[PDB]
Every structure is written in structure tokens, then in C-alpha cells.
């Protein structure tokens, strides 16, 4: 595994995430390190998990996914090392961070990271991120056996985060805002491609209510892509993996209709 993909909440504005790569480089000088992001919101293990959901599929099987948003650092919350179905390794706090990454490619084997010989010593209690997660990630990239990191554990011993699921209701489908595509202000839902094919049939616009905004009701064209309506006009579309989203063509949807994650969305014919 010569590729190490690296995510955290330490930011990219100071030297911290780079000290981590320094440790990794020394351990695994044959390795390539690519940053996922270091801009996860601080302590926000669910934001990080969401960022990581599509990382398994996008990255080659020879990747180590090294991840650390670890406000539980220096406590009884351990680090885990996981082999997934794709053959990738993934290292991080057992705090639910890897939950959605594992939804895409389940755990096949899991170990708690307990061995001193895969840690950067002496381990600093406020930076398990660098001393255990990053170092272990580098040891594995460097050819270390997974079983050498510490004791096997059962996959149910991996902490999982609840994720709401969209459903059929009254006369359409009810889901919620999962996240915002912050670079553009597009809104992303948890509504899968399959649920809405009944109301996709007729070429007519759909009804969308967002209840968090004094109960806003929009009528909206279901589009393949942004360019299909006039600039600044709203659309509905399937985002880049298979969820319903809302945006304005070459404008910012949420600046116009201020939704947050959690907000309910119903679509109906």
C-alpha cells in the first residue's frame, strides 16, 4: 500500500498536518501522501465521516486512508486499523469517524492499535493523531502486517454514527439535507436515485417543500445538470453520487434559501 490519503481537523494554515506527513515520510520513504482535507470543522467527527464516505470508491485498492479528528485523544478511545473489501487499509480513532467509509466498503478485519512498535515514541497525549494514527498508517504503508498493530476486534466493536434514510410518505418522498456543497452553495440530500422514478416519468416540474424556512414551497425542474436552466434559476438534479440535490445555475442556492443539514425535504409530483 504505497498511497496514503490523509484527512483531519487540524487545518492547513499552520505546520501541524505537515509535521504528520514528516513522521510518515520518515517511516515510509517509498510512499506518496495525498491530502484529503485538513479543513474538517474542529472536533466534527460527523463532518469528517461524510467527507470520507466516497473516499474508498475513488481511491485505488493500494491506499491507506489515514484519518484523524480526535478530540478523544489521550483517553480510553483507541485507534483502529481496518482492512476493507476493496483491500484498502484505513487507520483512525474508533469514534465513528470511519462509519460512512465502511458503509461503502465494509470491514473484513479489524485491530486496535496498541503496539508501541507502530507508534512514534514517546506518544504525546494530545496528538494521538500524529503519534499513533499517522505513524501506524506509515508502518502499514511500509509493509507492516496488519495483525502486528495490536489485538483483533470484531467489526461491531467499531463505533458507527446514525445516518437518516429518506422515505415514501404522503404523496412523494421525504428526506433531509445531509450537507451543503459549500464551494457553490448547492444543497445535498439523502434521497437516493431509486425513490423518485415514479415522479420522473412525466417531464413535469416537481414540488419541493423545505419545512425549516417558514415552510417554503418551490416548483422545480428536475435536470441532468446546471446548464439546463437559465443562469440564476433553480434546479433539482442527481449529484455526483446518486443523491438528489438543489442548486441555482451559476449562483448560490443556500444564500437564497438558507437551509441547514437536518432540515426536512419532501419532493412530490
Amino acid at each position: 500500500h504505497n498511497l496514503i490519503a490523509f484527512l483531519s481537523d487540524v487545518g492547513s494554515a499552520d505546520e501541524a498536518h505537515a509535521l504528520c506527513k514528516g513522521v510518515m515520510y520518515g517511516v515510509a520513504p517509498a510512499a506518496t501522501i495525498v491530502d484529503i482535507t485538513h479543513d474538517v470543522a474542529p472536533f466534527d467527527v460527523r463532518e469528517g465521516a461524510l467527507f470520507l464516505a466516497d473516499v474508498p470508491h475513488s481511491f485505488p485498492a493500494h491506499t491507506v486512508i489515514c484519518a484523524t479528528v480526535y478530540p478523544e485523544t489521550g483517553t480510553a478511545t483507541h485507534t483502529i486499523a481496518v482492512r476493507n473489501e476493496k483491500g484498502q487499509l484505513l487507520v483512525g480513532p474508533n469514534n465513528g469517524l470511519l462509519s460512512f467509509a465502511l458503509d461503502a466498503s465494509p470491514a473484513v478485519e479489524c485491530h486496535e492499535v496498541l503496539s508501541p512498535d507502530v507508534m512514534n515514541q514517546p506518544v504525546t497525549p494530545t496528538w494521538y493523531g500524529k503519534d499513533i494514527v499517522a505513524a501506524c498508517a506509515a508502518h502499514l504503508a511500509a509493509g507492516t502486517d496488519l495483525a502486528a498493530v495490536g489485538p483483533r476486534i470484531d467489526p461491531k466493536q467499531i463505533v458507527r454514527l446514525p445516518y437518516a434514510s429518506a422515505s415514501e410518505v404522503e404523496g412523494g418522498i421525504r428526506g433531509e439535507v445531509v450537507r451543503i456543497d459549500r464551494a457553490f452553495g448547492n444543497v445535498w440530500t439523502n434521497i437516493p436515485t431509486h425513490l423518485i422514478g415514479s415522479m420522473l416519468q412525466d417531464g413535469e416540474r416537481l414540488e419541493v417543500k423545505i419545512e425549516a424556512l417558514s415552510d417554503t414551497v418551490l416548483e422545480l425542474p428536475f435536470c441532468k445538470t446546471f446548464g439546463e436552466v437559465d443562469e440564476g434559476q433553480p434546479l433539482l438534479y442527481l449529484n455526483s453520487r446518486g443523491r438528489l440535490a438543489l442548486g441555482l445555475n451559476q449562483s448560490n442556492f443556500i444564500e437564497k434559501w438558507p437551509v441547514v443539514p437536518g432540515d426536512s425535504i419532501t419532493v412530490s409530483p
Copy 2:
């Protein structure tokens, strides 16, 4: 071409630009990927183009310049693959993005990217950036023949953006603000080294009017570098490739004199 240089408007604050590198890595595991920037303003194809202008000269001939600011994604606007005079390859939306990069090293051969075998399938209509641009960029880095991407097209079929040119007027030279050096607030013009050598002769300060600010007139020393005046004092200078600029020594010029791109600048003796 084992070097891939990567620019977009998707931002570096979430996992998106990294999923792109993931796709590329899988295709071209021998490749090095360096980010240009992922902070281009959203949909701002002219800002991206400006960022890319000096990239050809600075990068080695074995570079693939992979670029994607593509609000036309999933439409009749195609992706193009270009070999330039330097021998570099460049892949991106035919939307004017590569215009200024091509000013520095013209197109020698150009193809539209139409072949399924250089795309990451199935292609998502809202992310041609990842599925066509990035994948094609990776295929080429991986040794793929340029002609294998799709149909040759003539260089005039590459969309070009208008760029104003500075000129001789009344009693000096009239140009405009091209961009701001945002990290420092220095102002960059389109006034070439050659135009002002007549007023460079005498060692005297120059007159600079910026008409966008109720008609501001400054008298200003023409300097080699910032350090040549006292701290916080204004200067004129030739920036790092050969355009006239304005700044304060170890301060922020535009915070003091609020110009935007487009604003006219005349310099005279």
C-alpha cells in the same frame, strides 16, 4: 508525462479535489500530482485562466496541466486535450479556461475528449471535472496517445477570452488592473516592460492616475523592489513577469486605494 498539475474551482476545504486525485492515482500510479490551486472563484473561468497563464513556463515539459472550472459540465461544451510548443499536454473544458496558458505556449495539436476509454465510467453529468478531465489527464500521464482521446480539431476551435492590451495615449501609457495579488494587496496591471522606458530614463517619480476612485492622482517612485522605499510607503515596480504593479512596502495597497480589475491606470512622466 509523469507530472500532473491540477487546478479547479471546487475548493480545498472538502474531499472533492482529492477524489479527483484518487481517480488519477488509480489510472496513473507512476505519476506525481501537484496542486495548482483549488481556490479559483466559483464558475470564474477568467480568474482560472489568469492563474494558469504563467503555468506553462514555470512547469517542466513533462507536465500534464489538468484544469477544471466547468459550470458547463454535462452539456455540449466538450473537454479538449492539447499538446503545446513546450511539449506539455493540457486537458480542460473548451470554455476559454486555457486561453492564457495557450498565449504562452500555443497549441500544436488539439483533440476533443470523446473516447469512453479515457473517461471514468459511468460519467456523472455534474462532474465532467473528475470523470473526463481528470481521468483523461491520468490516461495521458499513463502513456496514452493524444490522438486516442477523440477527434482532432483546429486550434481556432479552442474558445479564447479577450484580454485588454495597454497603449500609448496623451502623454504616457494607459492600461488596466488585471488582478490583485490578494495575499499582499499589490495591484497588477497589463502594462508591459517595453512601453514605459521613455519615462524610466530620468530617475524622477511618475504620475499615476487610477480613474475608478473619484479620479485619484499619485506621484510615485519606480522601484526594482519593495524594500527601496520606507515601510508603508507606495511604489511602482515590474512584477515577477514583466508587468507594472503598485504596492506599499510591507503593507496593503488596495486597502488604502480600493481598485478592482478593469479599472484604468495611466502612467506618465
Copy 3:
């Protein structure tokens, strides 16, 4: 030295720091380039120096530490190339930038960078950062002898920045805020592990006065890690290399108690 670690104040939001990597890649195509940060505050050579302090220890001996915050560019302030005790090379403005990096691993040999053959020609007076620092860094990574860069100089000819030291006073220890961990708002002091072991004995909370805030006095638990108090409650702790710090558990300390660097901190039993 096949690893080049790169820091500056040019930002990561435009193409500038990437043009630098372009130059380096062309010179040293065998090299790996990792960014330290490009977000140092503009012209802030002391902020950059602080960021660089722990870089020697974290990075392998085969690193070139290439660094450039150089508002003295195009003046009599020269660039220097240094071999340290660890065997690493370090290239940058002789402006105090490398001061704290050198505290961690002193200079063993030093040269001013004067030779044209390790510069990217022609050298632009406003970007010694790219044309001399980065290019030289790349030449050295590429196998160039250190002595080939220019004239040896004595280590006392390297400009050093003053750093306050914490001390014993009245009935405890008096130090100061060195920097803030900006991603989290934790406060970092210059108080070493060794000074406070006398008041560490008894398991009791400590007194901390911060005089810059109308004279704030907190009573505070000395902890190994954040998780040891309730969420949102304040702690004292030893940060990740051996200095006393203050934070809130999974909250932002400085947003609550607005300290800056320079502010005095006394701890006492």
C-alpha cells in the same frame, strides 16, 4: 536529499506557491515536495519561524527545508544554505526566518547563496523566493554540493530572532503566550515541562493569571488531555512538545478569554 519541505507567506489561494514547485520539479525531477504551509501571515517572519521550529525533528534527515517569507527580496538581504546537526539542509532569507528551526538542530555549515548556477535565471527582484530560494533548494535536492552555492559564512552571521524565556518569580512561574492554536483556539505558552513540577506534586488545581485581560485569575485543573474535564470546561496541559497550554474541552478558549501572543501568564500553586 529527495524530500523538499516548502513554507512561505504567498498563500495557497492562487498559483504562486505552485509555480515554485514547478521550478523545483524541473530541477529535481527525482524529488518529492511536501508543503509545510503557505498561510504564514504576510511578511510575518516570526510567525513563519515559529511554524518552522518543530519541522527539523518531525522531518527525516533527507529533507531540504525550503522557506520563504521575504519582504526583503531584491535587496542586500541574502539567501542562505545551511546544513544542520541532523544532516538536513535548509534554504531561506537570512532574515531570522530559520532562527527557531536552528534552535532545534544547530547550523554545522553555512553558505550565502550567490552562485548564478543554482538560481533560476533571470532572477526577478520581487521573487527571490522562487528564483533563488526554491531553485537552490531544488539544486541541492538534485545532488549539488552545498559548497557550490556560494561563500561559506560563520553561523553568527545568521540573523537570530529574540524569544522570551519563562522564569520563576513570586510564588510560581511567569511566562508568556507564544502563539495560539488557531484551528481550536488553544493558547500556547513558553513554559517548559521542568519549571512547574513543584506545583504538580499535590493533585490540586493551579492559579493562572493572564494580566492582559483586566488581570483575569482562573483556578484550573492540570490535565494530560482535553477529555479529562467536562466538555466546554477549561484545562491546563502540556502541549505536543513540552509547553504549557490552556484550552476548553471541545470549545474555543481564546473566544472566551481573548489573549494575544506577548501576554504574560503566571501559574502558581
